[PDB]
Amino acid sequence: YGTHSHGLFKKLGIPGPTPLPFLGNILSYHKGFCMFDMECHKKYGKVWGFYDGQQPVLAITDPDMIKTVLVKECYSVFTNRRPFGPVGFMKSAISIAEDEEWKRLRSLLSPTFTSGKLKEMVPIIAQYGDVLVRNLRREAETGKPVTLKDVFGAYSMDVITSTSFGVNIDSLNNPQDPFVENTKKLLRFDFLDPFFLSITVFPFLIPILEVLNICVFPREVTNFLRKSVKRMKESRFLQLMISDLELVAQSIIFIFAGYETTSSVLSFIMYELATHPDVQQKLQEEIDAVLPNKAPPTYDTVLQMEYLDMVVNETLRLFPIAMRLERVCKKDVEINGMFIPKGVVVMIPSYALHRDPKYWTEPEKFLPERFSKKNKDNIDPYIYTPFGSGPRNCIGMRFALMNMKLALIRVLQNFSFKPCKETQIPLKLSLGGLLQPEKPVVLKVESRDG
Numbered sequence: 001y002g003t004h005s006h007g008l009f010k011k012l013g014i015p016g017p018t019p020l021p022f023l024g025n026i027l028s029y030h031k032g033f034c035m036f037d038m039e040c041h042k043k044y045g046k047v048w049g050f051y052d053g054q055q056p057v058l059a060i061t062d063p064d065m066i067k068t069v070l071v072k073e074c075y076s077v078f079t080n081r082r083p084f085g086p087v088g089f090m091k092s093a094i095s096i097a098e099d100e101e102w103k104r105l106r107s108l109l110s111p112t113f114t115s116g117k118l119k120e121m122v123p124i125i126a127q128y129g130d131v132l133v134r135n136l137r138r139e140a141e142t143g144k145p146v147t148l149k150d151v152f153g154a155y156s157m158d159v160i161t162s163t164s165f166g167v168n169i170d171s172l173n174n175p176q177d178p179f180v181e182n183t184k185k186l187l188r189f190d191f192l193d194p195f196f197l198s199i200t201v202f203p204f205l206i207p208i209l210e211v212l213n214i215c216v217f218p219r220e221v222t223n224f225l226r227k228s229v230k231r232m233k234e235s236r237f238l239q240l241m242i243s244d245l246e247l248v249a250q251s252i253i254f255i256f257a258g259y260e261t262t263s264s265v266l267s268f269i270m271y272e273l274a275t276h277p278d279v280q281q282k283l284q285e286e287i288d289a290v291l292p293n294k295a296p297p298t299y300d301t302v303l304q305m306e307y308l309d310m311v312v313n314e315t316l317r318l319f320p321i322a323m324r325l326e327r328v329c330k331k332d333v334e335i336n337g338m339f340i341p342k343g344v345v346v347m348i349p350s351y352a353l354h355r356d357p358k359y360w361t362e363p364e365k366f367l368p369e370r371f372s373k374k375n376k377d378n379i380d381p382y383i384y385t386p387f388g389s390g391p392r393n394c395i396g397m398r399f400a401l402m403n404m405k406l407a408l409i410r411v412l413q414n415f416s417f418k419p420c421k422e423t424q425i426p427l428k429l430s431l432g433g434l435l436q437p438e439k440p441v442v443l444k445v446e447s448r449d450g
């Protein structure tokens with residue numbers, strides 16, 4: 001044994017890197033997830049396979065197959081994502097839930113993320129849009145070059161607290177440690193770090209760890225928050241959901257999926273507006289045309305912003321946070337002539353696709369015009385997929401976008417961001433399992449006549 005699934009991609013006739021005995025193909029992750037995926041797409045073509053230990057992963061690319069798994073799948077065959085380390089009571093989280101139990105939660109929370117309940121949340125988010133400008137004004141006046149993800153991570157926190165349970169606080173290094181230390185600890189998992197890398201190789205550990213009540217969502221923070229929710233559940237997203245303890249699972253997840261996820265994207269965007277100060281100028285004017293001098297953004301003032309939408313999307317093109325998109329093959333099935341067997345993890349190289357000469361010309365270039373209607377809609381969904389596609393895509397995509405734009409509005413309409421000393425140029429991506437800069441983005445911020 002040690003090499004269970006290795007007979008697969010040979011007997012099936014699918015190309016790919018040849019695996020070692022217990023590791024299979026992991027050492028290839030020495031460059032990262034996206035790095036490994038670019039190489040594989042180039043070399044093995046449109047479809048190939050590799051082994052995450054003894055777990056076979058088939059990477060598809062033909063948009064025809066992509067729609068069939070991301071759409072023709074509601075229990076059909078594909079439906080769940082790869083199961084990871086000891087989850088504990090979080091096995092009730094919607095992003096972690098499976099099969100019928102998932103469809104329940106999904107179609108139960110959907111109401112909570114409708115337009116109308118969003119245009120209703122705007123007021124609140126705007127509130128923290130202004131706090132951001134205040135806190136950003138300090139670092140401008142002091143003349144010290146700013147570290148992005150810190151102000152954005154604070155903004156993300158501010159909006160997560162208030163919208164998840166109306167807990168209004170000024171996270172941003174001000175009353176920085178009330179109920180903020182817990183929340184602040186809910187970061188994305190780096191699946192390429194020692195711990196997870198081991199479990200991927202030795203999945204038999206999961207049942208072992210779970211008996212020792214070791215969970216991948218630290219008991220410390222989950223406990224705090226589970227008791228908090230109960231507190232205000234009595235005092236009374238929380239208000240809309242309001243099982244009694246499945247509710248605590250969702251609430252924590254939204255924070256997990258929206259926190260470091262938003263500030264991470266936002267910091268990337270402010271980076272592109274540095275050696276694209278020209279783009280920032282256009283954006284700035286577009287914001288002033290719609291909203292007079294420092295006019296307050298409205299739910300609809302945002303939708304009417306072609307350029308803002310172009311800058312955001314093109315940023316998400318180059319940097320699709322969830323590098324990959326994968327689903328698990330529930331049963332044996334063929335689909336568009338291919339045949340994938342039960343238990344195989346179907347992967348979709350989001351980052352690699354978003355940077356492949358086939359659909360993008362000079363793909364390394366940050367040029368917004370791609371999304372202006374004329375270049376726009378000449379691009380295939382299933383190819384550009386930052387929030388995924390189909391039934392099981394980002395349930396909070398719009399919210400994510402609103403939030404990120406509102407943050408751009410007030411910010412752009414008050415400051416100008418230009419590079420400085422430690423500001424890396426070009427970029428350089430980390431070789432870990434998270435799509436981050438590697439050496440955080442630093443930008444000098446100056447007030448716009450203030």
Ligand code: HEM
Nearest residue numbers: 095257258261262265322386387388389392393394396400
């Ligand atoms: C920069 C912002 C964000 C990006 C790029 C993003 C991206 C994604 C992606 C790519 C997926 C997987 C889609 C798929 O596999 O088809 C996903 C799932 C999910 N996201 Fe987000 N997301 C963002 C923000 C948020 C926010 C703010 C929330 C909070 C409501 C959220 C909640 C979720 C949930 C619950 C799922 C799981 C859905 C399910 O399996 O039913 N996301 N997101």
